[PDB]
Design a binder for this molecule. Structure first.
Ligand SMILES: OC[C@H]1O[C@@H](O)[C@H](O)[C@@H](O)[C@@H]1O
Ligand SMILES: OC[C@H]1O[C@@H](O)[C@H](O)[C@@H](O)[C@@H]1O
Length: 394
């Protein structure tokens, strides 16, 4: 349903939909603030559902699921010249651990989305974004500050969930829509046992193929250096239809944030050069326009921004308040943003293409494809260049 050799993915993530992220939908979390005190705000979906209880969580999430993304969004995505969406979903949509606070019902909307994709000629990855125990301790895994994916029976439970996804979505029923199943989003390589992670990836690969599925298997790079995965899941070993997903940002450390715009561009261009050298098909599955970490709660609930020297012992670079509203951005910041977007687009189209994080946010413009497009900062058509050939690819 896709030609990974000849076609380029031009896509958006449907983030914040089936896995809550505080920075993307702060309205769901802000009612728990006590004036300026954020100490009682649940930090992740696990604690949000636990605090509300099952009845309230289901009422509020049903409303969210039914309105956040609809068929109209898919029409607009097609109209903007995009050809692809990535759909994050948590393990809890399929299976609950014994005392899990999570509520279910996401699957109904996932299946509506697959139909909306079909109708609008949009292809899809399904992405397992959160595993039991957490694979990364990020709030976007569902469970912040825990790293227990490789503990106990959590890896086994994850493989059981994947087998459900494989039987439902990796077969003939959706072979015209689903062009990849991503085994696990952003496993935090540095804190994991990498040998066990590779075994997990291999078990998932083999399990899918054993169902008779020919669906591409997408592996996230686990924050390893470019080329790390070249010798894994290879044609030499009869392993085929494998894609590596690289994520790229320049905002989650003081060193990255302090780069001037030219150096930000040089780094983006180098992402392209280095991805080209790899031996698997590869796609930039998450990236954005952000040049700051100013979005409220981007680093987590009750954590500040490195950009204004309010987190992670970073030096003050500038004040975030002026940057929260795209109408208040300086001409220079708008120009820097457009340059940065174009350099990333060129870099990522140099291999398998790109998937912007994310389609929409409530009020975080750096992270919203819609907002950037409407304000003329994301090229429309997406091939438009105000700053052509910044990287010099050949
Ligand atoms: O090397 C690029 C690609 O070649 C294809 O033949 C394989 O099936 C893929 O798994 C691989 O990513
Ligand atoms: O570890 C700090 C940050 O790392 C980034 O790579 C992730 O995208 C963020 O979610 C996380 O907050």
């Amino acid at each position: 349903a896709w030609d990974y050799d000849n076609n380029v993915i031009r896509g958006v993530n449907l983030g914040g939909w089936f896995v809550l992220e505080p920075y993307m939908t702060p309205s769901l979390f802000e009612p728990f603030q006590n004036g300026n005190d954020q100490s009682g705000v649940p930090v992740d979906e696990y604690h949000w559902t636990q605090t509300l209880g099952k009845e309230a969580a289901l009422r509020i999430l049903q409303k969210h699921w039914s309105t956040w993304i609809t068929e109209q969004d898919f029409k607009q995505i097609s109209n903007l010249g995009l050809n692809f969406v990535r759909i994050p979903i948590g393990y809890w949509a399929f299976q609950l651990l014994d005392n899990d606070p999570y509520v279910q019902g996401q699957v109904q909307y996932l299946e509506k989305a697959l139909g909306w994709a079909r109708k609008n000629n949009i292809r899809v990855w399904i992405d397992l974004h959160g595993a039991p125990g957490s694979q990364n301790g990020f709030d976007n895994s569902g469970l912040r500050d825990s790293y227990n994916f490789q503990n106990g029976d959590n890896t086994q439970v994850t493989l059981n969930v994947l087998n459900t996804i494989f039987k439902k979505y990796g077969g003939n029923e959706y072979s015209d829509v689903v062009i990849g199943i991503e085994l696990l989003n952003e496993p935090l390589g540095p804190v994991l046992n990498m040998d066990k992670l590779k075994q997990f990836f291999l078990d998932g690969y083999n399990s899918l193929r054993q169902t008779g599925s020919v669906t591409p298997v997408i592996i996230h790079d686990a924050f390893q250096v470019f080329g790390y995965w070249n010798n894994f899941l290879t044609v030499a070993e009869g392993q085929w239809n494998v894609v590596v997903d690289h994520h790229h940002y320049q905002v989650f450390s003081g060193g990255e944030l302090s780069r001037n715009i030219n150096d930000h561009i040089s780094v983006a261009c180098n992402w392209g050069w280095d991805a080209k050298k790899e031996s698997h098909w590869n796609v930039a599955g998450q990236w954005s326009a952000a040049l700051t970490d100013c979005a409220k709660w981007l680093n987590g609930v009750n954590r500040g921004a490195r950009y204004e020297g309010a987190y992670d012992n970073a030096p003050y670079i500038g004040s975030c308040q002026p940057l929260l509203d795209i109408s208040q951005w300086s001409d220079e910041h708008k120009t820097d943003t457009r340059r940065y977007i174009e350099a990333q687009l060129d870099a990522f189209e140099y291999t398998g293409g790109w998937v912007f994080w994310s389609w929409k946010t409530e009020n975080a413009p750096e992270w919203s494809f819609q907002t950037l497009t409407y304000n003329g900062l994301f090229p429309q058509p997406v091939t438009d260049r105000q700053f052509p050939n910044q990287c010099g690819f050949h």
